[PDB]
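Forum: Protein Structure Q&A
Topic: Joint prediction for protein chains with partners

I've read a bunch of threads here and the consensus seems to be that you should model interacting components together rather than docking separate models afterwards. I'd like to see that in practice. Below is the full input, 894 residues plus whatever partners are listed. Could one of the regulars post the assembled result?
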Amino acid sequence: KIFNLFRVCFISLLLIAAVEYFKYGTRINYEWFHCTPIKEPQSGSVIKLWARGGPFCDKRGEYKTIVKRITRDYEPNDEHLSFCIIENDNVPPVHYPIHEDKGEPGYVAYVGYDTDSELVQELCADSTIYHM
Amino acid sequence: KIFNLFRVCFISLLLIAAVEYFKYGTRINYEWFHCTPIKEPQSGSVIKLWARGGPFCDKRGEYKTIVKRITRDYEPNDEHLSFCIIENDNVPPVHYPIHEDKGEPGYVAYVGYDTDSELVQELCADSTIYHM
Amino acid sequence: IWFSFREISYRHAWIAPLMILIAVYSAYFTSGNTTKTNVLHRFVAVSYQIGDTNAYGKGINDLCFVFYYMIFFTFLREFLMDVVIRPFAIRLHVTSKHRIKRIMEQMYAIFYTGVSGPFGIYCMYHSDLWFFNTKAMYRTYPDFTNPFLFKVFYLGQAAFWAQQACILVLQLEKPRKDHNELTFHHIVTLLLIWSSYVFHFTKMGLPIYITMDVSDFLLSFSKTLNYLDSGLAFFSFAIFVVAWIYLRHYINLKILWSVLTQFRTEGNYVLNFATQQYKCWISLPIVFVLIGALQLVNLYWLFLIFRVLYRILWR
Amino acid sequence: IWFSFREISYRHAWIAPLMILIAVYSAYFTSGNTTKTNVLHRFVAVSYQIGDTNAYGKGINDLCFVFYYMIFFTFLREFLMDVVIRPFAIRLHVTSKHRIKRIMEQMYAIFYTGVSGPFGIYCMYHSDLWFFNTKAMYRTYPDFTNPFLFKVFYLGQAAFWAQQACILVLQLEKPRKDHNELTFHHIVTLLLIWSSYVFHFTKMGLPIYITMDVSDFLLSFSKTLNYLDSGLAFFSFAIFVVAWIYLRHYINLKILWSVLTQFRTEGNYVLNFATQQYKCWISLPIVFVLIGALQLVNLYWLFLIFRVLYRILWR
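Posted by a regular:
Agreed with the consensus. Here's the joint model:
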């Protein structure tokens, strides 16, 4: 009777909430669906980040995955960071081909610890050096 | 007998997983626990972002909440964005007092649509103008 | 004296929903302002009006309005059923319990279905779908908005069907031969409503809803006229079977062929997850299998109808 | 001939755990390499060795190792219990079923508890806690690492107590007068183990575990010696009651007073959520109420013991 009704209604409302939360969440953080962060380390603790994705994930996917990866991977309270983000201006916002060549990369960023901070200062040409 | 054992063991393993996921997730995205994004709009669609938080949430909270808020609030596929992030260098990484004055703000960023892009180009003094 | 009130409540079960809904209406209307700044406006009127044009988004006020009209339809069911239908059937000289109750819910079916079918046809007439133009199914896909009448109809159907579903779950006393596929039908109907709403495409939902309504209308009419002295129930059933095939199965195959080919025999199926543009090899299988469930059940009902026809015209 | 094997399995229930664990050990040892690159190394040895110093982190290989030693302790329980204890008790001329089985599990209690108590005391001796120095509870708080012996002991206790808990859930045939507070005790013990592990502070856990072990050791010894011809069970019980108050309640009040004041009568309780430094008004109430549950139950057991003492010395 009543309890069966409450059980099924609660399951239905839970399923509705589950799908709506799926919608909202995946719309917010989609960058790890279409952009793949490929990292290439330099001499020391400093690495090269960029986003290697499909045609769809434009400079939003790029920038969001770079900032998320930087603030994720390198814990600051041991030693402060310093990074730079250099923009690829020769390219339009949405620029990848579906076939696996993807050509030019867009955003690309260097990040490391202050022990080899001189290396990142040299490696970033002129863009502002963000010491965090 | 057996089914009661599986029920209780599954509840225990679910609770363990719940607390471990709590740990991991809240360690990753803590910025909306201690930094509060206060926004102040300018003339047009362009706004002033900064992070108003406690002593704990240092420039990590600031930068992460600014980038998340920018990529969250302004949908690009209607019209492309353009923003700048200017750093407060007169300040050490961890700089807030617990009492509600919090003094100087750290990171601060301007973001808007390309219709009033000239306004953001003027408003950002010299730091790189990130058109996304 | 309150015992008389309990007696009225038990004999007439619509007073409580009536009282609560008239309270809501009186409080909203006498509030002075009828703007969105209220909360009763959330519970009584559609929300998310785009600026002031004719276009509406979605959200949670949709669920709130669904609940309020869940109460309103329960009230309407009880009040209409008893007060109007029962004396009307008694005057019709047909004296039983099984037959009279079956006629009761068939005549209620006729009433709401004749309200809804023509209304939905009106809604489709004021659209680019005119007489099931299945090309518009592939017009703007991630349309996050529907016209006023289109959405109010949509949610009206959602609220009504969910209310029949919950009354079915409540398991009153005695379903009846033909219950399992019936609850399958209602469950898949609610899943179709909620899915085809929350995945942004209702243009592909409306034609099927029209088919369902205008089929059930004639079904209930012929059934109740057979239950009454027939006179011509055979011709009514003939009209019903022709309309049943022509609308249900023909239009459903038309929609299924159109979706499968038009949305599949193309190069336009890619994710691009911001614009929620997953009209691709993901959402297709889901809605496809739902529609297939409906059509499959319709074929089973068709087989039952064919059996009835053969048995009746065999003797 | 396999029926004889089933008969052995039913009379002797340790062969299957023995067979599976010896398979695991043989496969790991004969693998050639004993390094972390294996997976049997995950299931048999502690993981997360910091570089090559004496410090270990955490993760999921902890749960894997817990499961494997869940199997190992089940095997040890069955094998030890039957093969050694049962003939030993039979030789002890005490002939019953109720008494003999109670003695069985009390003597098993003595064995594992005497293994664990002194081992834990050894672990605490090689620490900054020496004889329950409660100042070290407030040394490094978010310590994400423990010494080798410290962690292997920790997880050994976790695996063992969870195994008794699951055998309790399995509800074999007949708990016994005193079951409800018993399962309360085991449930809160497992919650204490898992919480005080996964919240990074085990320094505050170890002393309580020592108290529990060295109390239960003497309890089981005196109980089984009373069940056997006593001779001096009264003096053993006296030693037990003095040790029981002195260790359990005195040390638990020492720990509770120390945590409450030392971690509360300070200005150092702020979140700072990266360094997981929520030793604050959040984690305190949780672990405090857990310890309070333990101490409360210990007082109830104390009241029972006092009742026993009065009844025995009253006659």
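The CA atoms of residues 105 and 314 of chain C lie 29 Å apart.
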